[PDB]
Amino acid sequence: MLLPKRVKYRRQHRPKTTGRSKGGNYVTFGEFGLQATTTSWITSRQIESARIAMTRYMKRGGKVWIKIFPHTPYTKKPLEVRMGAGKGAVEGWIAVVKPGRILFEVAGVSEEVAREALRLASHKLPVKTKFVKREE
Amino acid sequence: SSTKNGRDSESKRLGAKRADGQFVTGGSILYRQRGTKIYPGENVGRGGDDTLFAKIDGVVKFERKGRDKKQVSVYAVA
Amino acid sequence: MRVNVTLACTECGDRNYITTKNKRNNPERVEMKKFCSRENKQTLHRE
RNA sequence: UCUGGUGACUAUAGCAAGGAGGUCACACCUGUUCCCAUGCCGAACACAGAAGUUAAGCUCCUUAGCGACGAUGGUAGUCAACUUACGUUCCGCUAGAGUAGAACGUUGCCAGGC
RNA sequence: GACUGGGGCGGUCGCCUCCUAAAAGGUAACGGAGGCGCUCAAAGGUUCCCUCAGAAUGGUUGGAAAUCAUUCAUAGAGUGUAAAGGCAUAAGGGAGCUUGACUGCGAGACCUACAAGUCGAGCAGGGUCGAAAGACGGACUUAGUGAUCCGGUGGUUCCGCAUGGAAGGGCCAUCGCUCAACGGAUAAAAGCUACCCCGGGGAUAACAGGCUUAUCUCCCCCAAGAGUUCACAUCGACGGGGAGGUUUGGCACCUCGAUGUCGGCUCAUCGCAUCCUGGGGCUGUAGUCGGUCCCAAGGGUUGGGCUGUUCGCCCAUUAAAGCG
RNA sequence: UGAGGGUAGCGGAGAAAUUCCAAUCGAACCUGGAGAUAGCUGGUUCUCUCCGAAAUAGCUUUAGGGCUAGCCUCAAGUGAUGAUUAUUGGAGGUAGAGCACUGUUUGGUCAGACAAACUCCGAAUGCCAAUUAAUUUAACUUGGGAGUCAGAACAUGGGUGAUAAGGUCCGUGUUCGAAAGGGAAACAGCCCAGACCACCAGCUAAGGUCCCAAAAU
Numbered sequence: 049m050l051l052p053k054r055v056k057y058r059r060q061h062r063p064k065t066t067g068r069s070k071g072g073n074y075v076t077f078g079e080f081g082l083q084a085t086t087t088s089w090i091t092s093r094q095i096e097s098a099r100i101a102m103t104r105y106m107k108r109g110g111k112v113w114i115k116i117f118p119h120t121p122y123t124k125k126p127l128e129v130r131m132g133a134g135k136g137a138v139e140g141w142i143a144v145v146k147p148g149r150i151l152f153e154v155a156g157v158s159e160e161v162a163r164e165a166l167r168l169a170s171h172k173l174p175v176k177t178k179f180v181k182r183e184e
Numbered sequence: 185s186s187t188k189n190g191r192d193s194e195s196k197r198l199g200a201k202r203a204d205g206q207f208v209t210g211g212s213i214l215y216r217q218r219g220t221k222i223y224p225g226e227n228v229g230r231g232g233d234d235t236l237f238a239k240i241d242g243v244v245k246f247e248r249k250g251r252d253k254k255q256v257s258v259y260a261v262a
Numbered sequence: 263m264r265v266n267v268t269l270a271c272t273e274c275g276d277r278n279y280i281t282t283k284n285k286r287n288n289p290e291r292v293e294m295k296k297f298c299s300r301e302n303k304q305t306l307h308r309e
Numbered sequence: 310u311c312u313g314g315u316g317a318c319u320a321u322a323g324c325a326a327g328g329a330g331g332u333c334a335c336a337c338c339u340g341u342u343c344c345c346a347u348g349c350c351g352a353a354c355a356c357a358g359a360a361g362u363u364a365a366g367c368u369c370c371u372u373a374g375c376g377a378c379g380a381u382g383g384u385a386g387u388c389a390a391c392u393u394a395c396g397u398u399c400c401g402c403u404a405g406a407g408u409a410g411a412a413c414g415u416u417g418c419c420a421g422g423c
Numbered sequence: 424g425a426c427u428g429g430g431g432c433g434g435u436c437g438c439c440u441c442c443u444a445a446a447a448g449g450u451a452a453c454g455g456a457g458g459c460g461c462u463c464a465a466a467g468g469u470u471c472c473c474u475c476a477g478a479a480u481g482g483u484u485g486g487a488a489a490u491c492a493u494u495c496a497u498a499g500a501g502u503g504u505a506a507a508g509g510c511a512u513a514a515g516g517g518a519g520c521u522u523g524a525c526u527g528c529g530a531g532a533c534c535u536a537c538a539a540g541u542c543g544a545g546c547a548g549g550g551u552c553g554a555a556a557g558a559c560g561g562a563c564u565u566a567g568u569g570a571u572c573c574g575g576u577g578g579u580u581c582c583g584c585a586u587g588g589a590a591g592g593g594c595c596a597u598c599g600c601u602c603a604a605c606g607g608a609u610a611a612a613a614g615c616u617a618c619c620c621c622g623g624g625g626a627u628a629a630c631a632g633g634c635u636u637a638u639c640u641c642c643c644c645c646a647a648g649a650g651u652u653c654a655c656a657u658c659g660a661c662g663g664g665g666a667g668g669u670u671u672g673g674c675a676c677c678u679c680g681a682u683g684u685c686g687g688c689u690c691a692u693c694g695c696a697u698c699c700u701g702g703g704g705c706u707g708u709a710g711u712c713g714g715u716c717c718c719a720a721g722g723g724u725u726g727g728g729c730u731g732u733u734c735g736c737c738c739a740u741u742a743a744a745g746c747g
Numbered sequence: 748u749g750a751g752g753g754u755a756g757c758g759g760a761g762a763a764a765u766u767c768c769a770a771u772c773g774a775a776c777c778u779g780g781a782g783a784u785a786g787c788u789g790g791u792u793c794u795c796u797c798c799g800a801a802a803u804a805g806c807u808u809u810a811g812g813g814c815u816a817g818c819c820u821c822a823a824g825u826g827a828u829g830a831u832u833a834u835u836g837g838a839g840g841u842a843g844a845g846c847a848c849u850g851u852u853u854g855g856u857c858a859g860a861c862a863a864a865c866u867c868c869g870a871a872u873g874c875c876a877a878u879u880a881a882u883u884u885a886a887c888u889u890g891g892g893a894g895u896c897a898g899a900a901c902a903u904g905g906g907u908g909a910u911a912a913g914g915u916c917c918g919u920g921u922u923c924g925a926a927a928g929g930g931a932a933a934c935a936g937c938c939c940a941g942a943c944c945a946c947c948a949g950c951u952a953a954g955g956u957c958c959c960a961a962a963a964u
């Protein structure tokens with residue numbers, strides 16, 4: 049469960065989601081990556097589920113680096129309430145991606161093993177990804 | 185539930201009152217500010233509450249002097 | 263306690279200033295001297 | 310030009326390692342007889358001055374490692390226009406931040422003695 | 424008393440600084456986050472000098488942060504009190520003398536519906552520190568507060584109802600407020616109405632229509648695993664994608680000179696996401712029975728006890744006792 | 748149960764229900780003060796000509812009301828002070844980008860990331876000016892008379908809600924409000940375009956060319 053220890057403010061505005069990625073476009077540690085091509089929030093439960101899926105098919109014979117972290121919290125009010133009179137408590141934590149940003153990296157495993165190992169994690173993430181190797 | 189918030193001070197109109205190049209008179213207010221964002225120069229007097237104003241009547245210039253510091257001068261003949 | 267007082271000149275009997283003092287830090291009467299109106303001089307002042 | 314005072318352009322002047330020099334001067338340095346000085350101390354600020362030395366300071370020179378300065382070219386944005394509902398597209402202006410090349414070991418004013 | 428995503432209940436009402444505020448000023452919500460209703464006789468004026476946090480090394484080890492010295496520091500401390508802008512020009516840190524925490528003013532401008540608020544060079548009267556030029560009418564800056572009327576106190580070169588005095592009024596100087604609902608109705612104020620009555624409004628609620636789909640009902644993708652081995656007979660974790668518009672809701676657009684509200688009788692009628700019957704495909708289907716999934720709306724779909732019942736639970740059947 | 752009588756509206760009577768007192772009783776009926784009062788509803792009668800708004804701010808025992816300011820109108824007076832680009836100067840910290848600071852953060856001082864209340868930096872536009880040139884025709888001052896203080900969709904920067912609503916609350920622009928006409932099958936707000944009246948003439952915009960239905964099977 050990925051969350052920061054302390055944040056300076058608990059209720060923040062919603063992040064902007066149009067354009068193209070600021071930075072973090074290239075594989076820099078590993079050898080094979082998973083860059084998204086559509087913009088969405090990812091809410092830190094769907095990274096616990098796409099990390100373990102990569103871990104099992106690799107037989108723990110390589111390393112896994114996740115390159116995103118949910119910094120921004122998002123709110124919600126309970127069911128059957130009227131509008132206004134405040135702003136709701138923190139439900140969970142989101143992280144914004146934009147098309148180009150590498151999500152996951154692998155290293156220490158073959159190519160034809162890792163290509164069928166990243167497909168088991170893109171079906172638990174909302175965005176449409178593809179399989180990018182290192183800059184040569 | 186409730187909110188503990190709201191509750192703001194209204195405003196204090198706080199910026200440049202005259203512009204670079206025009207004839208200001210003998211007591212015109214040239215800047216309102218907190219602290220000294222822009223220093224007093226020559227023929228310009230820094231007032232109390234730091235609102236710098238002109239002394240002799242002439243043109244104004246906003247001119248730079250340091251790395252990150254600025255000053256306001258007033259020159260006589262127009 | 264901080265209670266405002268009202269000064270008075272001695273050679274001429276007329277109140278002409280106001281101040282505030284702290285009753286703990288100065289229990290005794292304040293004895294400054296300031297400009298007066300009737301004499302154009304600076305005599306004493308005392309509550 | 311070459312030394313010192315003294316303001317300006319104000320890291321392209323800086324910071325750090327090396328190397329050279331000294332009656333012309335600036336310093337370093339010895340002193341408490343007094344004006345003057347420590348909330349402890351001639352260390353300092355004063356004050357007296359045959360002598361003692363370039364060692365550090367300041368002064369000159371070179372090496373671009375650090376800081377500062379920085380194009381052209383392209384991208385991100387975006388005022389206007391035209392379709393459009395798509396985490397939009399195409400066309401016309403302007404033009405960033407980062408990054409490469411590079412400039413760079415200061416350019417000058419005025420009185421006083423060489 | 425008013426605001427109020429109907430009213431009530433809870434909350435809040437004025438001033439100060441930041442953010443949303445869209446690179447000038449301005450700018451809303453029951454949007455996000457903090458303070459204020461004071462304190463200083465030196466923490467004010469002026470003059471002369473000093474520069475900080477921490478880090479690291481050493482020693483009565485007071486962890487090197489009690490105190491003690493050296494380096495390194497670029498502002499990472501401090502500035503009465505919140506936060507923003509600002510400054511080692513110091514606006515920060517220590518000493519001596521000191522009352523400018525002055526009387527009469529004020530060209531100009533900022534700001535603003537009005538009332539108010541803010542900055543002010545310079546000119547005179549008296550002073551203070553400094554050798555002098557000069558600086559000083561409160562505090563590094565902005566919050567620390569409240570119209571009028573009425574009464575109290577000190578002054579006065581002003582009137583004083585025939586004349587002389589007086590009681591009274593006048594101007595100048597100060598005092599009485601959680602009037603805090605803070606531009607303050609009055610010196611003085613709480614409830615009930617289903618016994619209710621007039622003026623209004625779909626400007627504003629309850630029922631139904633409408634938009635939306637978090638909830639609700641079904642449908643699906645990836646697949647770890649349960650099933651002797653065996654992901655897919657069957658079940659489908661952790662996560663992702665939609666359709667329907669029946670539930671509980673959100674918005675207040677239509678109707679307050681009437682849209683008047685639950686279940687069962689009477690009589691219908693339509694949808695397919697099919698309970699029965701008709702035709703197939705897999706099956707962990709031997710045979711009888713079953714389980715799932717696809718095409719299929721032609722007809723059919725019981726009689727009672729208990730509840731106002733919606734759901735529901737039970738009794739006897741039946742080919743079946745379908746959901747909207 | 749008949750007959751004759753008594754109690755009267757701040758009042759009578761009540762085996763008690765706000766029950767009855769001339770078809771009406773949480774306080775009867777009739778004339779008078781009285782044409783009570785109403786910030787709330789309905790209504791308000793002849794014709795042409797010119798200009799033509801607002802639904803916002805501040806305070807309110809205020810929130811569907813009022814007063815001043817804003818926007819329109821008629822008359823007087825000063826008389827280029829109004830607008831638009833071009834060149835020029837300057838104030839300021841958004842979008843973007845970057846971690847030098849304040850917090851966040853993954854893998855071994857090095858590599859990478861995040862930010863409404865972070866900034867070594869920082870546009871495009873906007874804003875204030877010069878009294879400089881070019882095209883245009885407004886603008887301030889004093890006085891007479893009202894209106895308005897319920898705004899709506901669409902586009903584009905953001906808040907709140909669920910990157911929900913034809914939701915609600917602010918900034919800038921347009922149309923409806925107060926606007927007919929052609930188009931979108933029908934449809935105040937979308938796209939083209941502003942009707943002085945007449946004509947059985949002409950060229951075009953948005954959109955269209957088989958037929959209904961004008962124009963290319």
Ligand SMILES: [Mg+2]
Nearest residue numbers: 529530531532
């Ligand atoms: Mg004035």
Ligand SMILES: [Mg+2]
Nearest residue numbers: 534535539540
């Ligand atoms: Mg005024």
